[PDB]
Design an enzyme around this catalytic site. Structure first.
Site, mmCIF file in Angstrom:
data_model
loop_
_atom_site.group_PDB
_atom_site.id
_atom_site.type_symbol
_atom_site.label_atom_id
_atom_site.label_comp_id
_atom_site.label_asym_id
_atom_site.label_seq_id
_atom_site.Cartn_x
_atom_site.Cartn_y
_atom_site.Cartn_z
ATOM 1 N N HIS A 1 6.078 1.726 -8.477
ATOM 2 C CA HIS A 1 6.669 3.061 -8.452
ATOM 3 C C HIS A 1 8.089 3.151 -7.971
ATOM 4 O O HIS A 1 8.847 4.087 -8.245
ATOM 5 C CB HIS A 1 5.671 4.044 -7.831
ATOM 6 N N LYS B 1 -1.464 9.752 -24.212
ATOM 7 C CA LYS B 1 -1.545 8.351 -24.608
ATOM 8 C C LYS B 1 -2.675 7.643 -23.887
ATOM 9 O O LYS B 1 -3.506 7.014 -24.508
ATOM 10 C CB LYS B 1 -0.303 7.522 -24.354
ATOM 11 N N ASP B 2 -2.673 7.787 -22.573
ATOM 12 C CA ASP B 2 -3.703 7.182 -21.745
ATOM 13 C C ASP B 2 -5.099 7.658 -22.111
ATOM 14 O O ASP B 2 -6.025 6.853 -22.266
ATOM 15 C CB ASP B 2 -3.462 7.427 -20.261
ATOM 16 N N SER C 1 8.598 1.074 -14.985
ATOM 17 C CA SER C 1 8.192 0.392 -16.166
ATOM 18 C C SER C 1 9.263 -0.152 -17.083
ATOM 19 O O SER C 1 10.128 0.474 -17.656
ATOM 20 C CB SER C 1 7.100 1.185 -16.835
ATOM 21 N N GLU D 1 -18.258 -18.021 -18.307
ATOM 22 C CA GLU D 1 -18.141 -16.995 -19.339
ATOM 23 C C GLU D 1 -16.755 -17.019 -19.971
ATOM 24 O O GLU D 1 -15.916 -17.843 -19.625
ATOM 25 C CB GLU D 1 -18.422 -15.613 -18.753
HETATM 26 C C1 HEM Z 1 -7.101 -5.383 -10.976
HETATM 27 C C2 HEM Z 1 -6.353 -5.612 -12.044
HETATM 28 C C3 HEM Z 1 -5.130 -4.782 -12.429
HETATM 29 C C4 HEM Z 1 -4.972 -3.466 -12.635
HETATM 30 C C5 HEM Z 1 -6.046 -2.358 -12.612
HETATM 31 C C6 HEM Z 1 -3.598 -3.248 -12.998
HETATM 32 C C7 HEM Z 1 -2.982 -2.103 -13.348
HETATM 33 C C8 HEM Z 1 -1.752 -1.819 -13.733
HETATM 34 C C9 HEM Z 1 -1.246 -0.653 -14.440
HETATM 35 C C10 HEM Z 1 -2.164 0.544 -14.706
HETATM 36 C C11 HEM Z 1 0.047 -0.854 -14.704
HETATM 37 C C12 HEM Z 1 1.079 0.014 -15.448
HETATM 38 C C13 HEM Z 1 1.171 -0.221 -16.963
HETATM 39 C C14 HEM Z 1 1.563 -1.520 -17.577
HETATM 40 O O1 HEM Z 1 2.683 -2.042 -17.430
HETATM 41 O O2 HEM Z 1 0.741 -2.157 -18.289
HETATM 42 C C15 HEM Z 1 0.414 -2.169 -14.221
HETATM 43 C C16 HEM Z 1 1.656 -2.767 -14.319
HETATM 44 C C17 HEM Z 1 1.979 -4.032 -13.865
HETATM 45 N N1 HEM Z 1 1.060 -4.962 -13.440
HETATM 46 FE FE1 HEM Z 1 -0.928 -4.675 -13.271
HETATM 47 N N2 HEM Z 1 -2.901 -4.449 -12.960
HETATM 48 C C18 HEM Z 1 -3.838 -5.403 -12.610
HETATM 49 C C19 HEM Z 1 -3.533 -6.745 -12.541
HETATM 50 C C20 HEM Z 1 -2.297 -7.357 -12.520
HETATM 51 C C21 HEM Z 1 -2.030 -8.798 -12.254
HETATM 52 C C22 HEM Z 1 -3.120 -9.828 -12.029
HETATM 53 C C23 HEM Z 1 -0.678 -8.864 -12.153
HETATM 54 C C24 HEM Z 1 0.211 -10.075 -12.023
HETATM 55 C C25 HEM Z 1 -0.087 -11.125 -11.281
HETATM 56 C C26 HEM Z 1 -0.143 -7.558 -12.516
HETATM 57 C C27 HEM Z 1 1.196 -7.263 -12.561
HETATM 58 C C28 HEM Z 1 1.727 -6.109 -13.063
HETATM 59 C C29 HEM Z 1 3.128 -5.895 -13.281
HETATM 60 C C30 HEM Z 1 4.266 -6.897 -13.024
HETATM 61 C C31 HEM Z 1 3.290 -4.650 -13.798
HETATM 62 C C32 HEM Z 1 4.596 -3.926 -14.228
HETATM 63 C C33 HEM Z 1 5.230 -4.247 -15.579
HETATM 64 C C34 HEM Z 1 6.306 -3.420 -16.111
HETATM 65 O O3 HEM Z 1 6.008 -2.330 -16.610
HETATM 66 O O4 HEM Z 1 7.475 -3.866 -16.023
HETATM 67 N N3 HEM Z 1 -1.110 -6.631 -12.792
HETATM 68 N N4 HEM Z 1 -0.712 -2.742 -13.652
#
Ligand code: HEM
Ligand code: HEM
Lengths: 32, 56, 270, 106, 43, 446, 419, 33, 55, 111, 55
Positions: C92, C118-119, C96, C162
């Site tokens: 935040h 969208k969501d 993005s 799995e």
């Molecule tokens: C429990 C699992 C996870 C949930 C529920 C989650 C959820 C989210 C959501 C809802 C967003 C915003 C939309 C998007 O960019 O796709 C986001 C962005 C992001 N997530 Fe995750 N995420 C998870 C796992 C991870 C993992 C394992 C990593 C990296 C090690 C990660 C890194 C990031 C990053 C870097 C962004 C920002 C990207 C950008 O828009 O520039 N996420 N995450």
């Protein structure tokens, strides 16, 4: 004002090492 | 290539009252302590082994 | 970076979750899968052995282990939600990124108006897939057919994690040595946090750099290739393949991409 | 000793740009860079013209991305026109900071 | 990586080792209570 | 051609000389036009008792308003028509009166000064005229946060000691002060050996020594007893005094750790330390590129308006720290950087950094000495402070022994695990809790 | 040991040097750009220029500059005058060379970068605010813009409306036209002249005539009045002094001192100051008054300065005038002129008794005259003033177009027609 | 701001060569006469 | 502000990261996986708690 | 937010008090403009091409008089409720509400 | 700010509700129950998870 203001006596509150009025606290201060 | 012996001459001739084996910085110091540590420890370890081997 | 590192933690936490839940039902696949994974921890030289025995709560995987997984499975997801929110928190603070790869501050939109629909739409498709699976082919994606109560002397010669964990099992196989395989298994997953440091190009967007778009895809298809191995007899054919896929994966991530980055930068004269 | 290879590379560079999205997009190559702390300062150093330009370009670009529409063939960024306008600015910013490190180091 | 390395930095490293060195000792003590090596106990 | 070192050794040495009573004569020659002759008496505020707390400072208003020889405005008229300036400054340890004057004016210069020190025609009228003035100065000093705060510091790091009193003294001691009391004061403390007659410029030492005439010599036992009361240690206390006035636009904070007397090997090494942190103002031209972190941070983040590190040097006491003026909302951040700079200094000093400060020192300590007035005050004060040496060429040597490890070990005595003396004149609402400033002087984290 | 050594080159830049004994050397390039060199469209540019000394330049980046001088403990001070702009540079004997190369970049190779100049901007406000804390500055400034029309009426601080509007081509232009060879004078307090020259010759050869800013002088009587809420009121009353380094001027200076009230004694009152006496007698208990004396190339300003309270403003103001009228009526006895003189003489010598003082004095002289007049000679000139001469000058203030500036509650401050 | 109530303040400007000379420096900064 | 529900409660302001937040225009479909990611976390949980209501 | 808010409130929640005050304001606005010769001339000219050849001046008060809090509420909801806005800005418009936000402001679920 | 650990990470700033926050001076011992209340929740939790490791 500022000149008039002065510290309350800390002898009772103050530690024994710093309790004395005319001697050094440096050679008494570290132990405390 | 380079040629900057002139910089080092100056660095080592600097009157900082340091012994040559330290005149060169902080690394000289860590190297020194590492060396000294290993030697003393080793020496201690060796004495232990001898005390140990003295016995049947 | 900070968001990336949380992600990574996220990923790995879920990974633990999934590994213990699948064992709760205590069926032939579950039973064995826990043994062979957990035991794969006994590779560590000094401790390992003692430590595998603590995790199990004994010498095997009897009740003691089974109730542990039940408790940790239960409590991980709650802990993970905290993480997610922490992840969101950091994100935040910079918003993005985009396909172009450039800041959009000059183009910004209401999240409510647009991105709430969208969501919701996304959901709609997501659910679709989840019910399509769950209603029409319940077992399809759940490779394991072992609805057999676990008998500790019995063994499905074909033991494997799995689909999510399929890649991990394959990585372990390519290395002869046990310990070498555990390190390399961890490095599979744990190699993620390096990539920040590996980045070589001036364009954070791969979008404008063909060459990485090609090696990005290949990694994905290498990843698919590895997943395949996971459900494969551990024999010559698959061995030799997996081994070159496991090198390909680490090359793609460690060495190829980073170079490609540079190249592209130099062709653009950057 | 680069006459043929580099010559191929020069031809290759145009292809690389053509291969690259930015040329297709019509936005300048310099504009595409990962906005980090150095880029950031360079950015800030831009004249009103250069700098407002980079704002419209990205505006027009993120608009297209939002609509999944490509710009007309006639209006695309041609490799031969590589405004490396950030480069000048961006170099120094780095140059300054590399120094800073040298002064800090010794 | 390269930026971090410097001729000037050495005093900090030397200072760190003692604090670091002191910190290292604590872990051995901390680990040992949990570890309960018979040899450690013998020590 | 000529090189720094060389110049150094070439500098006109200071000649220290003595009269029969202990009158100390010093002087540095240059055969230049203007001269600044001065009498640097060393009976300050710290000898005052609770009543005569502002005694000395009171004498200073009378110093220039008449001698039995030179009545009402005879002193000023005399100085003026020569074109000479006459200044009187008073400290908690040192009172001093000096004259700036054409070198040919020594004759009537040194006479005047001498006269001044000894005969001071002080009538009831002048006493009651000065009172009113003093009371009005006091009121005006309450209008200065920096002065209000630094007094506080002293009072709290000297709580329970003679040294903690304002040199301006107690409001009502000015009202009360008996006319008889200025006499005993003067009589008991103006007796040399205390005093030194110093001077710099175009004069010949020979003549200054020959020229000087002692009106009287304070052989006195009381003169000794009066001295005897002086020089006692003043108990060191780490307390804070927080006087919050949200009415005021800025915030003044003076934070200190007690230090060495006037003479000590640790006492030059400290300086080299503060060279590093430095001092900073809204108007420094370097701002963000200035090489001292507190400055850079400050410059960069609009952290503070102005900040200076100090070393206050007394015989048995010393105040060490810095002082920063900063918006109501930035008190804590500047506290953090500062203290942070201290700790970093006693654990991580690097030779580079200490070598730059070193050189700063030299300059600060050479450039000060430019001009006649300057030299004179160094020579006068130097004699009651450090005794009768003029460490000027030594300095470079001593300053030279400076090493990053020397600087580190000396700084750690005084700052590390020590208990601060903090005072502020709020907006102090955001001023760190004493325990927080305390734990600031040791390194777990932050 | 060795006395200074001036040298005018083909360019017309002066250079001096004194290998002193002591450890500290100080160079200082005085360029002839004062505030008086800006127009309606260029006002505030020297100010910013003055504050932009540590910016990147062609051979040294803002970071190296600052960190570099710090390295060695050096100071870089720019002194700005309505007429001149001294760029001072202190440091240790050994480090002049590292320092000099800094002074040269700052002054001959400035690179005002849109981004750098822009972040400065806000500094102007901060600087203006801190110098406008002393009534003396806003009044003294108000004075110069009232008394002049065109050139010296320009103030040293940037006008509030201009601040952010100071553009990089402005800075570049100002340097280019004014920071030139003919207008420059190097000055060393601990450097070799032989080596100084060489350097001067290598780095200070740039062309630029005078007045591309719009040089010229002119005096115009006028009054600038600034109402406040403060108890105290300050006002200045001043008539065209005599010009710089001329006899009339000099006379003024001596006269100045006969009334001139700059206390020579701490907590002490002047017996000597006529103004003070006369004012005092007709005035209340708390009040402050001082004579004022300014001298520039093509004009001067002489008269006094007062600090009275609300109701006393006039009484003091007139009082002071009346007394200076006395001297203009002829009433002035020999005994007081000689005192004055000696006062002056003593002051000028103490002025130059310090490195910093000396260095200023010398450069100053190099931009006016073209050489260094020794002290003695100086001293002689001041002595030549006739007791009458003084009166005569004085006659000129009373009979010279008035120009005043005041601040505070102005119910009781005389206007032009009031006195 | 410093209170200017008593007989102490005389401030008035008039020097030899320099008149109203303003100096700005990084180390320091001021206003003289 | 008065009766701007959102920033009235401090709590409800914290929820304006969904509604009011700056979101880039251009944005592949790929980013919906963040949100869905959460979706899945919430579904597993509701599901888990009911299964662990009879397991 | 406040403005649109005002609109909505208006067509659902107008109170007789409130409408009666605005009523009266209108009268004055409409009487005081007509003070002076120029003003009367423009009303008369423009009135004729606008409203045709009537001069509704005395009518007004009558028409204005028929005003009721219900009248004002029903009349406002024709034109502002559920209706699509026409919004222009000349930035800093970076915070200006997204077209859809503005739009949803013309109906009342919450806010 | 630079290198002020606390405000550097945004996350770490959030934790300065413990360290820097305005706390009343006068304050009965009663208040210590809030904190204690939270120690109890953490205790219960760790205990529970170990009990539910063998239940
Ligand atoms: C429990 C699992 C996870 C949930 C529920 C989650 C959820 C989210 C959501 C809802 C967003 C915003 C939309 C998007 O960019 O796709 C986001 C962005 C992001 N997530 Fe995750 N995420 C998870 C796992 C991870 C993992 C394992 C990593 C990296 C090690 C990660 C890194 C990031 C990053 C870097 C962004 C920002 C990207 C950008 O828009 O520039 N996420 N995450
Ligand atoms: C994303 C986090 C979770 C994942 C990946 C996950 C995954 C799994 C998997 C793969 C199984 C094996 C089912 C089978 O094939 O028979 C399982 C079982 C189970 N899980 Fe979950 N689960 C998660 C969260 C939870 C939560 C939060 C709870 C409790 C609130 C829970 C309770 C159970 C129970 C009681 C079983 C055993 C009965 C069965 O086989 O359905 N799980 N979980």
């Amino acid at each position: 004002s500022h000149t008039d203001i002065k510290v309350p006596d800390f002898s009772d509150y103050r530690r024994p090492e710093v309790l004395d009025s005319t001697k050094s606290s440096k050679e008494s201060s570290e132990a405390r | 290539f380079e040629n900057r012996v002139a910089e080092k001459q100056k660095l080592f001739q600097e009157d900082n009252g340091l012994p040559v084996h330290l005149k060169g910085g902080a690394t000289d110091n860590i190297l020194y302590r590492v060396t000294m540590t290993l030697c003393l420890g080793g020496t201690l370890y060796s004495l232990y082994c001898l005390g140990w081997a003295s016995f049947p | 970076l900070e968001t990336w590192n949380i992600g990574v933690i996220l990923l790995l936490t879920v990974m633990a979750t999934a590994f213990m839940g699948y064992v709760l039902p205590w069926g032939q696949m579950s039973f064995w899968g826990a043994t062979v994974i957990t035991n794969l921890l006994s590779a560590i030289p000094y401790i390992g052995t003692n430590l595998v025995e603590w995790i199990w709560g004994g010498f095997s995987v009897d009740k003691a282990t089974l109730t542990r997984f039940f408790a940790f499975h239960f409590i991980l997801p709650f802990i993970i939600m905290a993480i997610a929110m922490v992840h969101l928190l950091f994100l935040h603070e910079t918003g993005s990124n985009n396909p172009t790869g450039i800041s959009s501050d000059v183009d910004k939109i209401p999240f409510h108006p647009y991105y709430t629909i969208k969501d919701i739409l996304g959901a709609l498709l997501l659910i679709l897939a989840l019910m399509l699976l769950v209603l029409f082919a319940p077992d399809l994606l759940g490779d394991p057919d072992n609805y057999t109560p676990a008998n500790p002397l019995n063994t499905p010669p074909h033991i494997k994690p799995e689909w999510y964990f399929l890649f991990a099992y394959a990585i372990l196989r390519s290395i002869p040595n046990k310990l070498g395989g555990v390190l390399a298994l961890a490095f599979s997953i744990l190699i993620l946090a390096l990539i920040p440091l590996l980045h070589t190009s001036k364009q954070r967007s791969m979008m404008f750099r063909p060459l990485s778009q090609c090696l990005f895809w290949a990694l994905v298809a290498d990843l698919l290739t590895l997943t395949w191995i996971g459900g494969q007899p551990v024999e010559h054919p698959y061995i030799t393949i997996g081994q070159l896929a496991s090198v390909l994966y680490f090359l793609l991530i460690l060495v190829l991409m980073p170079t490609a980055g540079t190249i592209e930068n130099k062709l653009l004269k950057w | 000793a680069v006459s043929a290879s580099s010559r191929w590379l020069e031809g290759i560079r145009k292809w690389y740009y053509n291969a690259a999205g930015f040329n297709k997009l019509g936005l300048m190559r310099d504009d595409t860079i990962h906005e980090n702390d150095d880029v950031k300062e360079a950015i800030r150093r831009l004249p009103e013209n250069l700098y407002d330009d980079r704002v419209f370009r990205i505006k027009r670009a993120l608009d297209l991305s939002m609509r999944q529409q490509i710009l007309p063939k006639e209006q695309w960024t041609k490799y031969e026109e590589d405004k490396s306008y950030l480069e000048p600015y961006l170099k120094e910013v780095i140059r300054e900071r590399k120094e800073r490190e040298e002064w800090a180091k010794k | 990586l390269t930026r971090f390395l410097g001729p000037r930095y050495r005093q900090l490293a030397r200072n760190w080792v003692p604090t670091a060195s002191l910190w290292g000792a604590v872990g051995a003590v901390g680990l040992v209570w949990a570890t309960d090596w018979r040899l450690i106990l013998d020590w | 051609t000529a090189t720094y070192a060389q110049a150094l050794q070439s500098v006109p040495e200071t000649q220290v000389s003595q009269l029969d009573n202990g009158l100390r004569v010093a002087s540095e020659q240059s055969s230049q036009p203007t001269c600044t002759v001065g009498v640097w008496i060393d009976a300050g505020s710290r000898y005052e008792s609770e009543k005569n707390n502002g005694a000395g400072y009171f004498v200073e208003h009378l110093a220039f308003k008449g001698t039995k020889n030179r009545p009402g405005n005879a002193l000023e008229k005399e100085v003026e028509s020569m074109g000479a300036h006459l200044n009187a400054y008073s400290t908690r340890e040192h009172t001093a009166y000096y004259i700036k004057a054409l070198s040919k004016d020594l004759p009537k210069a040194v006479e005047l000064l001498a006269d001044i020190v000894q005969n001071c025609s002080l009538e009831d009228s002048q006493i009651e005229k000065e009172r009113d003035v003093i009371l009005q100065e006091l009121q005006e000093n309450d209008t200065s946060m920096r002065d209000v705060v630094f007094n506080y510091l002293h009072a709290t790091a000297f709580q329970g000691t003679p040294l903690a009193q304002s040199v301006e003294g107690p409001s009502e001691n000015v009202r009360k002060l008996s006319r008889a009391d200025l006499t005993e004061y003067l009589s008991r403390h103006y007796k040399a050996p205390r005093m030194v007659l110093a001077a710099a410029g175009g004069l010949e030492h020979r003549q200054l020594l020959d020229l000087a005439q002692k009106h009287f010599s304070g052989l006195s036992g009381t003169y000794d007893e009066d001295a005897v009361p002086t020089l006692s240690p003043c108990r060191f206390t780490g307390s804070q005094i927080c006087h919050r006035e949200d009415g005021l636009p800025l915030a003044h904070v003076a934070i200190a750790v007690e230090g060495p007397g006037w003479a000590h090997p640790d006492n030059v090494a400290l300086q080299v330390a503060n060279a590093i942190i430095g001092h900073y103002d809204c108007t420094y031209g370097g701002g963000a590129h200035l090489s001292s972190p507190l400055a850079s941070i400050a410059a960069t983040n609009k952290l503070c308006q102005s900040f200076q590190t100090f070393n206050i040097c007394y015989a048995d006491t010393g105040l060490l720290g810095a002082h920063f003026v900063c918006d109501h909302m930035s008190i804590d951040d500047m506290m953090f950087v500062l203290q942070g700079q201290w700790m970093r200094l006693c654990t991580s000093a690097t030779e580079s950094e200490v070598l730059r400060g070193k050189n700063l020192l030299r300059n600060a300590l050479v450039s000060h000495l430019d001009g006649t007035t300057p030299v004179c005050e160094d020579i006068g004060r130097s004699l009651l402070t450090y005794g009768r040496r003029i460490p000027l060429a030594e300095w470079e040597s001593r300053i030279a022994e400076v090493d990053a490890r020397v600087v580190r070990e000396v700084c750690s005595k005084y700052f590390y695990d020590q208990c601060p003396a903090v005072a502020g004149f709020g907006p102090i609402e955001q001023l760190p809790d004493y325990n927080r400033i305390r734990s600031g002087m040791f390194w777990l984290r932050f | 040991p060795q006395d200074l050594e001036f040298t005018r080159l083909p360019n017309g830049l002066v250079i001096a040097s004194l290998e002193n004994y002591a450890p500290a050397s100080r160079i200082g390039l005085f360029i002839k750009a004062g505030s008086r060199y800006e127009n309606s469209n260029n006002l505030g540019t020297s100010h910013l220029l003055r504050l932009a000394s540590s910016l990147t330049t062609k051979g040294a980046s803002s970071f190296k500059i600052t960190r570099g001088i710090e390295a060695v403990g050096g100071k870089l001070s720019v002194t700005s005058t309505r007429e001149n702009m001294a760029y001072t540079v202190e440091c240790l004997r050994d480090d002049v060379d590292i320092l000099m190369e800094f002074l040269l970049n700052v002054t001959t190779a400035p690179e005002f970068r849109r981004w750098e100049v822009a972040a400065l901007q806000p500094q102007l406000r901060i600087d203006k605010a801190v110098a406008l804390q002393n009534p003396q500055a806003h009044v003294i400034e108000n004075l110069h813009a009232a008394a002049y029309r065109n050139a010296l009426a320009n103030s040293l601080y940037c006008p509030d409306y201009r601040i952010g509007k100071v553009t990089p081509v402005e800075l570049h232009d100002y340097v280019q036209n004014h920071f030139t060879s003919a207008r420059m004078a190097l000055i060393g307090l601990g450097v070799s002249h032989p080596v100084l020259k060489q350097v001067a010759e290598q780095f200070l050869n740039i062309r630029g005539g005078l007045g591309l800013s719009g040089a010229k002088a002119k005096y115009h009587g006028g009054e600038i009045r600034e109402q406040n809420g403060d108890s105290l009121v300050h006002a200045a009353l001043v008539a065209e002094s005599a010009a710089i380094g001329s006899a009339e001027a000099n006379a003024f200076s001596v006269l100045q001192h006969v009334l001139g009230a700059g206390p020579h004694v701490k907590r002490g009152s002047n017996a000597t100051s006529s103004l003070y006496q006369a004012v005092a007698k007709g005035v209340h208990q708390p009040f402050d008054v001082s004579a004022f004396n300014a001298s520039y190339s093509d004009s001067g300003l002489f008269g006094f300065y007062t600090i009275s309270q609300a109701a006393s403003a006039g009484d003091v103001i007139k009082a002071a005038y009346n007394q200076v009228k006395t001297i203009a009526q002829g009433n002035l006895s020999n005994p007081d002129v000689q005192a004055a003189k000696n006062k002056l003489k003593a002051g000028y010598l103490m002025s130059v008794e310090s490195s910093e003082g000396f260095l200023d004095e010398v450069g100053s002289q190099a931009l006016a005259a073209g050489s260094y007049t020794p002290p003695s000679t100086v001293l002689q000139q001041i002595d030549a003033v006739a007791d009458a001469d003084v009166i005569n000058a004085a006659k000129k203030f009373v009979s010279g177009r008035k120009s005043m500036a005041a601040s505070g509650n102005l119910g009781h401050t005389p206007f032009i027609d009031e006195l | 701001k410093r209170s200017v109530l008593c007989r102490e303040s005389l401030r008035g400007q008039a020097a030899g060569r320099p008149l109203v000379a303003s100096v700005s420096l990084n180390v320091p900064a001021s206003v003289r006469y | 502000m008065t009766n701007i529900r959102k920033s009235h409660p401090l709590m409800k302001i914290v929820n304006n990261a969904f509604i009011d937040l700056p979101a880039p225009s251009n944005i592949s479909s790929w980013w919906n996986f963040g949100s869905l990611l959460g979706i899945c976390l919430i579904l597993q949980i509701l599901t888990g708690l009911f299964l662990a209501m009879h397991y």
